[PDB]
């Protein structure tokens, strides 16, 4: 049966949405707004009253004192809106090349594994959204493979810290140590620490 | 003690949200070894350049600089429905995006219009020299500037699969002038 | 004494200006002349203005701007000396500007 | 056929191109750059590095 | 004049710079694919819809 309305077109709505993604800067924010409320409406996740991260309890102890503060200075507060923004960013299209709020931590003691473990758990609940920032997160990960335990860092950097995927296949590792910076995200450079080649 | 209510009730959430009205670009990351954005650009042959994704610092809004510390609260201070179950009705989201797709198409209308006028288009401004005989303010030959050619003619005959216009010979080719122009 | 090339009653002087100024040697100009665009940001920065000063004062003003633009050192190389004044193992995260 | 530099002749010119600066380029301000303390003093290394 | 307001248009606002404004005068803007170097490619079907 006829409706009857002016048929909703496939094209145009794709072009006028594409031009708006060059002039109108807050397009991204409006795309998030519509699909973040759907997460909060479906009632999928909600913050609780009390805290319970690192205990298993009987802590506060004298030996734990060092490990206690390391996890405490890593704790994010259960803000209802901050949780929803993570579930929504997973699907929503972006226009600005966002990168991580960077941390300066020289891996000194065994209690510093509470930083590398954070980058693991972030790479599981959000596998996409981890692709875009894989290079800047690689830059602060090389300190774990150098200061913490060398020899491998000495033989891995020997090959180089960056490659190009081209040659119609294969990989072209450049035998030189360079940093990431994120500014070269959209080019022909993949962070070499995520290669998989042995 | 989380994974069950994390890979069932939360898994069917993305499974549907992956195909909405305003979500379009592929952000897939199942092979970190090889994947790129493949960005497009808005360019005119008359000196203009605007990308869709570009490098810049944080904007005046919370979309840039992704916080990585938002992992510990969602492993401890977050009760799930622990699986009562609520299904959000399709009405509030289908119409929500339908009106956002309206604002864009109605807000981009002015600058796509007033811009179009000062472009001319579908014209050439040419001149014809009378090869004696009897004139007529017509016939002779048809001259056009190279810049007018590249703007209108070149980007249009380029859409189809025709080999670019043949170069005029220093020698005489009154034979194949139209034969190569036929292609 | 050129911008009045057609506004003075004094007849003799008029024909003269519109002869040596019309000349195939010199030419007068005023206003915006050209623009230098930006690499990454993509905005107008250093604009040239066909100003109405004299060669003696205009020469001095250019020595300044050129030595400001040929520094090639951003305001971010400031935090590399701001750090030489604290505990040897500290660091900063620069609000990149370029 | 080039341009004879006007900074060396006698007769004074009265109009010329001056390289100005727009309202985007700004000089001599501040940066809200932040610090992060070495956290512990005991395990710092001035010795070599 | 047709109500639909433009709070910001073409202008990009970085929080550590202020409010920079671009031009809005395109012409025959044919959305085309960019190669890694920063060059317009062309029309190779089976890749670009």
């Amino acid at each position: 049966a006829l409706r009857p309305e002016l048929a909703f077109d496939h094209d145009h709505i794709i072009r006028c949405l594409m031009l708006a993604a060059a002039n109108y800067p807050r397009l991204e924010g409006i795309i998030v707004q519509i699909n973040t409320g759907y997460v909060a409406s479906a009632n999928v996740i909600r913050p609780v009253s009390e805290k319970r991260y690192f205990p298993e309890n009987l802590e506060q102890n004298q030996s734990a004192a060092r490990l206690v503060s390391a996890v405490k200075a890593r704790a994010s507060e259960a803000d209802i809106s901050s949780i929803h923004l993570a579930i929504a960013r997973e699907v929503s299209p972006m226009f600005n090349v966002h990168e991580l709020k960077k941390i300066a931590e020289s891996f000194e003691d065994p209690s510093s594994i509470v930083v590398v473990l954070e980058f693991i758990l972030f790479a599981l609940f959000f596998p996409t959204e981890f692709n875009r920032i894989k290079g800047d997160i690689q830059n602060v990960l090389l300190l774990f493979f150098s200061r913490w335990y060398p020899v491998e860092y000495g033989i891995f950097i020997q090959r180089g810290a960056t490659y190009t995927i081209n040659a119609a296949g294969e990989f072209e590792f450049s035998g030189r140590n360079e940093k990431w910076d994120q500014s070269l995200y959209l080019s022909e450079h993949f962070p070499a620490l995520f290669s998989d080649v042995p | 003690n989380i994974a069950v209510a994390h890979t069932d009730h939360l898994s069917v959430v993305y499974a549907t949200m992956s195909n909405f009205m305003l979500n379009f670009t592929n952000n897939f990351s199942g092979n970190h070894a090889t994947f790129k954005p493949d960005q497009y650009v808005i360019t005119s042959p008359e000196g203009s350049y605007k990308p869709i994704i570009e490098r810049q610092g944080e904007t005046v809004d919370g979309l840039t600089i992704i916080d990585t510390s938002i992992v510990w609260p969602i492993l401890c201070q977050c009760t799930y429905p622990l699986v009562e179950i609520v299904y959000p009705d399709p009405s509030t989201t289908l119409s929500q995006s339908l009106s956002v797709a309206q604002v864009l198409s109605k807000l981009t209308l002015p600058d796509a219009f007033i811009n179009m006028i000062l472009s001319g288009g579908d014209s050439v401004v040419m001149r014809t020299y009378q090869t004696e005989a009897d004139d007529d303010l017509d016939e002779g030959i048809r001259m056009t500037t190279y810049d007018q050619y590249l703007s209108h003619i070149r980007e249009r005959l380029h859409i189809t699969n025709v080999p670019d216009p043949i170069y005029i010979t220093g020698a005489s080719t009154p034979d194949q002038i139209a034969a190569s122009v036929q292609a | 004494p050129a911008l009045l090339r057609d506004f003075t009653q004094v007849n003799w002087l008029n024909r003269d200006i519109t002869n040596m100024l019309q000349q195939a040697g010199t030419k007068y100009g005023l206003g915006l002349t050209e623009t230098r665009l930006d690499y990454v940001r993509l905005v107008k920065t250093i604009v040239g203005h066909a100003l109405n000063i004299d060669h003696f004062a205009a020469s001095v003003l250019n020595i300044n701007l050129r030595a400001l633009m040929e520094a090639n050192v951003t305001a971010d190389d400031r935090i590399k000396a701001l750090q030489a004044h604290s505990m040897i193992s500290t660091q900063f995260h620069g609000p990149n500007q370029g | 056929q080039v341009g004879i530099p006007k900074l060396e002749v006698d007769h004074i010119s009265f109009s010329n191109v001056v390289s100005m600066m727009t309202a985007n380029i700004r000089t001599g301000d501040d940066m809200a750059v932040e610090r992060v303390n070495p956290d512990d003093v005991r395990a710092i290394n001035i010795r070599n590095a | 004049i047709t109500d639909v307001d433009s709070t910001d248009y073409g202008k990009l606002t970085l929080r550590f710079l202020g409010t920079l404004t671009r031009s809005l005068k395109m012409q025959n803007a044919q959305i085309r694919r960019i190669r890694p170097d920063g060059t317009v490619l062309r029309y190779d079907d089976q890749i670009d819809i």
């Binding site: 507060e77 | 610092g57 600089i65 916080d67 | 935090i79 | 501040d30 809200a32 750059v33 932040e34 | -």
Partner: peptide, 16 residues
Amino acid sequence: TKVIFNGLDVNTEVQP
């Protein structure tokens, strides 16, 4: 309490 914030941080001030 360690609260979750997004953008860059503000502390000390530079000088020309």
